[PDB]
Design a protein around this ligand. Structure first.
Ligand code: CL
Ligand code: CL
Ligand code: CL
Ligand code: CL
Ligand code: CL
Ligand code: CL
Ligand code: CL
Ligand code: CL
Ligand code: CL
Ligand code: CL
Ligand code: CL
Ligand code: CL
Ligand code: CL
Ligand code: CL
Ligand code: CL
Ligand code: CL
Ligand code: CL
Ligand code: CL
Ligand code: CL
Ligand code: CL
Ligand code: NA
Ligand code: NA
Ligand code: NA
Ligand code: NA
Lengths: 395, 395, 395, 395
């Protein structure tokens, strides 16, 4: 069969816009993909239009052939917007190829190496311990979650003495351990807020006695080598990688021993074609994979198949389709709610895992095209905090 | 003063599209910038629209403050499209600030450290030596050029035995030295065609006895460390960097001794704000700067000011406004011509140098807005070569 | 315009001599600079006389051109006295160029990236905790200081058992935390007193639990590599660099991971031209800048502009114009007072920050030339301590 | 005995000024020293006045005690001017101590390890081979020289194509080997002219087949680590170090394998106290010492004693007291002559060696104080070349 149409939908995932892509073939199949929301998502349709010129008329079962062509046409490493678009197109190709062969996507990835896919709940705030307990218990009752990710920050990190900032985080984690179920796993996302390796090490070592599931992305991404310096003398599990794009950025991170767990995003790195390369590198270095996934239900489905097939996958970031809107930080349980509607039958956890749908070819979800037409673009931007001197710090 | 409007022009530079940006202020000044042409340039206006939200109402003389805000809003390192847009906005801010202070831009960069700016002619093909001689001599008579850049490739590198490919390049360079003026400098751009460090070393060492001005970008960009391996045992000057984006990618290249000369592009890396950081790093490592510049006359003007102020600048890539259309490779002098019209009074070489315009504030060129309205978008894409087995190689 | 006169003033800053330099132009402008006080400051005027030969008749807006000429004429790296003189001349050139363009100096440095400049109070002694509290509170009430720098040494380090020396410092810091405001930041300057990396590590790790803002310059400067050894296994923030001169000494410090925060002095390294290079290197290595500044009000003004423009600047060392004379160490609040008078309108802190003067071109201070004529040279020398065996240790 | 007076003489050594220092004692002895001529030599007397405060009344036989006190009072590493002054004072102390003990200085340095001291003639220009032959033969007949140092540069290195610059140097060395005596040794001083390690390597390897005695100081001094990169793949003996100041700068050079032969200057590094430390480090690294010495006859005498006592000393740079004035480069035999008169009985070579004077205590030369009063200061400065674009390069 041959690719013969692309359809691009500008929709939304609660308060963030979301570009969803379909590739159709001349034998009546359609594959679907989800772009990461970097910000200026109105840039994605013209990128997709350009990339489609290289896919028109091609055999979609030549997945890596076509994805690599997209990379090479670009020539410059694409980074954010270009790779987001390539990621969705990669997804479409895997989906088409799986549907052509009448199999779930994981059968094109070496088969399922696990029966279900562990998730943690993206909570992202720093609620007082009793409120945290109540929210964790609610999520546990409904979906079986026993792992959760919070912000460690209990004060403005630029407006208080650093020792007091760190003590507030340590005291907070202690209070959580005194309050919530003893089996619950709690990760902390420091959200690339910290400039100095030594400061990131101090915070990690203050959290370490309370067993963080992982300590995520404390530093900025551009200097990879400094991550190896951070990790020397660090007593907790260090995770990073959402802000890294390709096999080579991850290779350097691994070479310098800059992480214990890596967190590529399948909507950021160029889809499964690149995600699998990255995970294979990590596997040889004895590093696990916890995919980054604050994206929507189609992205979640793509992650299910990748995760099911990857030996060194450990746990998947997860946001409920109906539930909390996007947030980072704050001493509450986020009040803003929303419902993401572009997937009819999203993967929902049962007993803390997403479950395979082995009798459905492709991703195993149905798209709601009417819902996508109903809800269009919404502007979204990050908050870049300021220091008291008026300078900008880091989002 | 405050930024109060952005105007975005979709125009062209011969056969490549070109997005030109103006930022206007409430005291009637305008600054101008040029985006790199990565490919899908219809993506640039929506990126610019989004970024402008962070510039509206701001003091344009806070250049690094605002450019860094654009970087931090993005959070993920932007790479190609995002940084191209940021680059043009950076240019606009320097131009506005210089016009506000009634000085040439170089006076905002520590002042001029040279009186004029050496250029080499971007020829880019591999013409037989007599034709090369004639073209070099024509360019020398008219503009004073004594330095030129060619392709080294005299055959399809994937369809002949490698030893014969390299011998053809060495024989070619020998024939040029037997034919053209003895003082002419000749650089070779291998155009990121070669996969293996050892192969790149073999070619460089075959060219070395004939004194290439530099041997440019032989390998792909993603693995930075392999460049240090290439350069060990390399007998000629190695240049690279057009495909690298920021201070940290260049820092690693420098740390591994991966180049003797670096070639960032001021329309790719985020403009002068980043270019200066990159050049400062190189300077401390005793590495020169030969800016990448296959872009148009506004980009050339930006480069004039950066180059004039930077001690370790050596030579600037240059394409005539009226002349050869874009090309890489081929055993001729490119027949396709064009005229780039969006600058009224472009910098033209005299005796092989671009000359400062010290009595003109800002970049020192006038934009032709009517010309920009007259010539709009044109589709352009790279050629990704195939091997005889049907696989895709590298553009 | 052209430089057409130099005027050199031998004056003083309380108990230390101070050479202040003016460069005048033929269009009636004057730029001002401040030399570091290394010791034999009567050597500075003849150095300045010699250097002026290279500046006479030149365009002062070619700042880096001229400063680099001074460096290259010297050929040998200048170190202390030569670079002190070059530093003041660099200051004069930035000041002239800013006045010529009618802007504050920070507009020549990429613009302001913050609205005001955080300072810490240079206290420098080791007063008992109640006296420290009272002094900190006085400084806080008057100027808004919330950050202070002390000596850690509570006994003669060469006349007591080392474990007892370190315990005395740790007990002291504990007593300060039990006594002073919980938000106050306290740095310790070990003043290059310690010979052995292991000893410096032991002291730093004894201070670390009480959150030193930074631990400054514990070792001697000549062996840069040993700083990387010190910092391995060090649990507090390490700062150094006042005794390092140029981009390359700082590059090595950064390469070996020898500091978390660097402290170049703008009167020592060759002024802003070199300071900016050094800060750019540190920025790429994710290292902050806390400029060294025990110098006077003109030096402070130069620092204001540099600090305002530099993203990775964090905090500025500050001594009041009217207040404590120079001191290091001792278990009191220094009794010796003085008043530095060569600046009419010095930058004074408000709420713990120095404030920009955006409507004043140049540094934004007026020099008191009559005051400079009134108070001339005073002899000053360091105290080099002895060990009980009669040997000399380190100042 | 106690030091009780210092006398400072501002005199000259042909066309360069020279500060000569005497320290007198209360038992009627005098020791003598020579400062390097960095440039602004009127700065030296006030430095000396300040340093003398630490020597007055002291026992001059405590040489390292006092020299280290001078270093520690300075605290900051002194670099050029400060160390030049310290160097002369160090010389004075060795001379006094040797005279007090009635021995030649070498008996205070572990004794003579050789009977005489090999010298090479500092010629410094690049004369055509027949003229070189004639000059070498004249110097050989008169003084027994069989080793000579030239400039390699036969054209302006910034105004010709680099391959042609290097070829001119190689052709030149070939012509010398075809013309001069087969046993003559010829060194080349590239005079810190070359920016790029790769370029320095290319030139060295072009000279290598003709056996340069050494290839001196091709690169700039500030980045020490790049010297290790240069030397990797270099086929000739590499010498450097005149521009390095202390045991630690030399330690790093040695650690990176940045030289085969080191060239500290005994008037630059702080005299014998530091020179011996530097030479001991080099000895353990299996690196020889060829002291830098374009200075005058007193400096030469100091070098005789150091060289006589140092096992890894190889050869000493030498300029005749009556003969060629200071020069670097040029395609002639320097026409400018002069006579240096401040030493009555300077060391002159016999059969290519300086000869010990074992029956004379101290340095073994008499100072001509009347000559020093007769000829005073003369202004001298370096030539910093320009490139054709108007930028400054390197002296
Ligand atoms: Cl992109
Ligand atoms: Cl459960
Ligand atoms: Cl807060
Ligand atoms: Cl489900
Ligand atoms: Cl992007
Ligand atoms: Cl010509
Ligand atoms: Cl072919
Ligand atoms: Cl073939
Ligand atoms: Cl030539
Ligand atoms: Cl022109
Ligand atoms: Cl100096
Ligand atoms: Cl307060
Ligand atoms: Cl004591
Ligand atoms: Cl004790
Ligand atoms: Cl606080
Ligand atoms: Cl004030
Ligand atoms: Cl000095
Ligand atoms: Cl002989
Ligand atoms: Cl010439
Ligand atoms: Cl003699
Ligand atoms: Na995250
Ligand atoms: Na290129
Ligand atoms: Na200090
Ligand atoms: Na020399």
């Amino acid at each position: 069969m041959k690719i013969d149409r692309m359809r691009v939908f500008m929709t939304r995932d609660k308060d963030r816009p979301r570009v969803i892509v379909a590739l159709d073939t001349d034998d009546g199949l359609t594959g679907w993909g989800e772009c990461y929301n970097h910000g200026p998502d109105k840039a994605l349709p013209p990128i997709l239009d350009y990339l489609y010129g290289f896919l028109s008329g091609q055999d979609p079962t030549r997945i890596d052939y076509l994805v690599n062509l997209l990379i090479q046409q670009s020539r410059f490493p694409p980074g954010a917007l270009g790779l987001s678009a390539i990621s969705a197109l990669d997804h479409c190709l895997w989906d088409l190829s799986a549907k052509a062969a009448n199999v779930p996507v994981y059968k094109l990835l070496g088969g399922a190496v696990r029966d279900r896919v562990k998730v943690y709940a993206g909570v992202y705030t720093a609620p007082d311990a009793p409120a945290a307990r109540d929210e964790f218990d609610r999520l546990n009752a409904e979906w079986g979650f026993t792992a959760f990710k919070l912000s460690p920050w209990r004060v403005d990190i630029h407006a208080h003495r650093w020792g007091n900032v760190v003590k507030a985080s340590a005291d907070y984690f202690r209070s959580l351990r005194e309050t919530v179920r003893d089996d619950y796993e709690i990760a902390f996302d420091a959200h690339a807020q910290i400039f100095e390796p030594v400061a990131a090490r101090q915070l990690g070592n203050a959290l370490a006695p309370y067993d963080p599931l992982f300590y995520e992305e404390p530093l900025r991404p551009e200097n990879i080598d400094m991550w190896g310096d951070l990790k020397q003398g660090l007593n907790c599990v260090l995770a990073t990688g959402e802000s890294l794009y390709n096999r080579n950025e991850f290779l350097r991170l691994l070479q310098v021993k800059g992480a214990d767990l890596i967190q590529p995003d399948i909507c950021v790195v160029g889809g499964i074609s690149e995600m699998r390369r990255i995970a294979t590198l990590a596997e040889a270095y004895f590093v696990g994979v916890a995919p980054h996934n604050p994206m929507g239900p189609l992205a979640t489905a793509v992650n299910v198949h990748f995760s099911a097939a990857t030996q060194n996958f450990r746990i998947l970031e997860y946001r409920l389709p109906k539930g909390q809107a996007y947030v980072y930080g704050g001493k509450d349980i986020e009040k803003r709610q929303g419902e993401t509607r572009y997937v009819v039958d999203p993967y929902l956890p049962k007993d803390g895992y997403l479950e395979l749908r082995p009798d459905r070819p492709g991703w195993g979800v149905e798209m709601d095209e009417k819902a996508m037409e109903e809800e269009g673009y919404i502007h979204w931007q990050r908050r870049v905090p300021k220091r008291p001197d008026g300078s900008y710090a880091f989002a």
